[PDB]
């Protein structure tokens, strides 16, 4: 079924120093390490959502460069996250269900409802989130994820690999630092743009409320501080304020009195401009590769080619080549360049004699028939 | 094999090896490499610039080709944007109205026939993606393990070769941490694959050797000064 029951409101809260996690699984102690990866900026304005069912209104939240999920609901309501780009059974979509034991992580072509939820009836939910899914490719089952306690999550999708970070720290978003640990790294290879949480309720639907935090990650650079035990206790957001930039440049948390020259500022470009000649006539390239008979070696003929749109992509469909060595230019990055005049030197030589067609070579064909500078 | 050797591969360990399998056209085997551009790269299968592994590919004209036309292999020709590295797109939408004819179908098929010579024959590609890093190794080579000795021997922990002494460490390695790294970017501690104990890696004893000698025209007896090293070491 597909019923719109869950409603959601929005609010804002300041995330002082939350969202720090280990960039790599290496042990470091009593050393300041600088890393560049997707992190949560300090003192950012994260959105605090409030979901409540009184007994459409909850659109899918964007997933621009990962997201940071946090929730202090100590009743086990959050039971997974939906990941996808269109969520209408057009492409693959990641579905995570964080139940009591042996959670299931499967990506398929789900037909998600407007307001997905789990209907616990105890018996597990009958999967009212999706209508049907048959063309699935990957499935993963492992231990539950983090089975007043605060739970934090970080999801990233880089080069097809989906990285999950999580760490539970008891609280009395308070101040301090709490680094997250890498828990699950699974490959999906799918485009993720929108995401939505799952609220668990019992079924005559039982009323309830839930609150969680959502923060969007950005490519940042942090200066992590490792104590003697090997745990992150402090961090510096080099792009927050110029003081933090000086701290990252000096690689120290204490900056003495003075003037320091930080990185230079540069005005970023607003748009791209492409300027090419207005020639539109096709190229005579379809007059040399489809020739009946070439000339001899001593009488090699060349064809001057000018005033054309040289689309070299039509050459690959004819036949492969035993030698496609391009000197100074790349075979793939060839349709995005201009040339003064291109001459196609066509000649037929013996098979074993194809060794001297190159700069600086010598032989019977090079020194007497055809020489390249 | 990018970053690894095709022959020196049975002596290393890996975290998780994924074998990507797909068949492309013969003349279209040019973009299976980091940083390449083209139709199959930007629309079908893209490799990251930091790729590490062996891109195995061979001809399969005798298996994936039929004279009557083997149309069961498709390829995406049109797409709204370029494909990211290690991304999959199986959607059958038309790149207008509900049907094509004016927008066209982006899922074209290969005309795999034995009549077509080299360049149009199907080629099977097996991308053995390797990730060798500080992550705990789950797959290794056929090399057998030896007994562990502590307190100056050569060690080999999951392919990490070196020379030094091993001592009982008092560190607090996390379950997902396998190797340690000091300021000098060297390995100072490592976790054994068999036993979960942590052992520190310290280089063996060394020091400068300064020879104290008078003029050769006076005598031939010399003195040796082991600077920085105690007499008991």
């Amino acid at each position, epitope marked *: 079924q597909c019923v719109n029951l869950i409603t959601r409101t929005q609010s804002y809260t300041n995330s002082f120093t939350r969202g720090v996690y280990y960039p790599d699984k290496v042990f470091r102690s009593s050393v300041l390490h600088s890393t560049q990866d997707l992190f949560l900026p300090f003192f950012s304005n994260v959105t605090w959502f409030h979901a409540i069912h009184v007994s459409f209104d909850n659109p899918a939240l964007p997933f621009n460069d990962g997201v940071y999920f946090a929730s202090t609901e100590k009743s086990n309501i959050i039971r997974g996250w939906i990941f996808g780009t269109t969520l209408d059974s057009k492409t693959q979509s990641l579905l995570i269900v964080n139940n009591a034991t042996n959670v299931v992580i499967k990506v398929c072509e789900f037909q998600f409802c407007n307001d997905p939820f789990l209907d616990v009836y105890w018996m597990e939910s009958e999967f009212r989130v999706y209508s049907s899914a048959n063309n699935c490719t990957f499935e993963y089952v492992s231990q539950p994820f983090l089975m007043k306690n605060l739970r934090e999550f970080v999801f990233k999708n880089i080069d097809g690999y989906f990285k999950i970070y999580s760490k539970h720290t008891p609280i009395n978003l308070p101040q301090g630092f709490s680094a997250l640990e890498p828990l699950v790294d699974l490959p999906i290879g799918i485009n993720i743009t929108r995401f939505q949480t799952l609220l668990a309720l019992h079924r005559g639907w039982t009323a309830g409320a839930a609150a969680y935090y959502v923060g969007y990650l950005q490519p940042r650079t942090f200066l992590l501080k490792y104590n003697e035990n090997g745990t992150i206790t402090d961090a510096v957001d080099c792009a927050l304020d110029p003081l933090s930039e000086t701290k990252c440049t000096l690689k120290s948390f204490t900056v003495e009195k003075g003037i320091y020259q930080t990185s230079n500022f540069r005005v970023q470009p607003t748009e791209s401009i492409v300027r090419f000649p207005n020639i539109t006539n096709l190229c005579p390239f379809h*007059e*040399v590769f*489809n*020739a*009946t*008979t*070439f*000339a001899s070696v001593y009488a090699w*003929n*060349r*064809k001057r080619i000018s005033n054309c749109v040289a689309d070299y992509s039509v050459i690959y469909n004819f036949a492969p080549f035993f030698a496609f060595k391009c000197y100074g230019v790349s075979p793939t990055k060839l349709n995005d360049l201009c040339f003064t005049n291109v001459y*196609a030197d*066509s000649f037929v030589i013996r098979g074993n004699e194809v060794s001297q067609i190159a700069p600086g070579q010598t032989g019977n064909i090079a020194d007497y028939n055809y020489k390249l500078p | 094999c990018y970053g690894v050797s095709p022959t020196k591969l049975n002596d290393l360990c890996f975290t998780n090896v994924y074998a990507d399998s797909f068949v492309i056209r013969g003349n279209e085997v040019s973009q299976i490499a980091p940083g390449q551009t083209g139709n199959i790269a930007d629309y079908n299968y893209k490799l990251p610039d930091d790729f590490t592994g062996c891109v195995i590919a061979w001809n399969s004209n005798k298996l994936d080709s039929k*004279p009557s036309g083997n149309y069961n292999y498709l390829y995406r020709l049109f797409r709204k944007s370029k494909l990211k590295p290690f991304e999959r797109d199986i959607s059958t939408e038309i790149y207008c109205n509900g049907v094509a004819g004016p927008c066209y179908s982006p899922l074209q098929s290969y005309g795999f026939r*034995p*009549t*077509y*010579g080299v360049g149009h024959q199907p080629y099977r590609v097996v991308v053995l993606s390797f990730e060798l890093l500080h992550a705990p190794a789950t797959v290794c080579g056929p090399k057998k393990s030896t007994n562990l000795v502590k307190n100056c021997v050569n060690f080999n922990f999951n392919g990490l070769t070196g020379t030094g002494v091993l001592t009982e460490s008092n560190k607090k390695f996390l379950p997902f941490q396998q190797f340690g790294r000091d300021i000098a970017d060297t390995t100072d501690a490592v976790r054994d694959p068999q036993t979960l104990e942590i052992l520190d890696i310290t280089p063996c004893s060394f020091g400068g050797v300064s020879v104290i000698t008078p003029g050769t025209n006076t005598s031939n007896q010399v003195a040796v000064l082991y600077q920085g090293v105690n007499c008991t070491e």
Partner: antibody
Amino acid sequence: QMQLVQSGAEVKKPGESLKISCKGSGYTFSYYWIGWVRQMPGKGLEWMGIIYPGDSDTRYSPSFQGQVTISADKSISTAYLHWSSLKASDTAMYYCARQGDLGDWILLGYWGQGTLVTVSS
Amino acid sequence: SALTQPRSVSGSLGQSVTISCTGISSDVGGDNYVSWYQQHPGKAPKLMIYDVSKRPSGVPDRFSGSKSGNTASLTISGLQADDEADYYCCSYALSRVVFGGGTMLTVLG
């Protein structure tokens, strides 16, 4: 001397997808190109394509890319044509030709006996 | 491009005829990709003139060709009573052969 022969004439209805063959002898058949020529009654000649018996690198005319296919059996040195979805526009004479030692690979050195395909109902 | 030829021509016994055919293309490697074929009514075609600078074996010496720009000419001397047949020009410079509209050679007497 080198000889070349085709199959007998056939008359089919639109939709039967008949098949014709051509057999040669007296020369290395796998090293000489061979093709077919379409000739409609009362009009000029039309060229469909040729095939190399060694490796069937078939090259078809732009006007015959989706109307007929050319094949050859290298085990017996016999060519084989296959018409898909025969129609009323296929009532033309089919003459085969070979490369020969006279001109280039595309030059038609010799010709066959010809096979008449008359579409009727 | 398409080759152009006169559909019907008129000749006589013992005279000469110069069949004209235009629309010949060219590619890298040469421009002499011109050949002629003869097909008697009710008989298989026979190669008479190819590579007009040369002549085939067995073909009588009364057949000859020439080139002038994009126009070729087939010169036949001594039209006999058995020379009444069709002639076609062929161009294979672009790896694709093309045939003209056909020249029906008729003689008077």
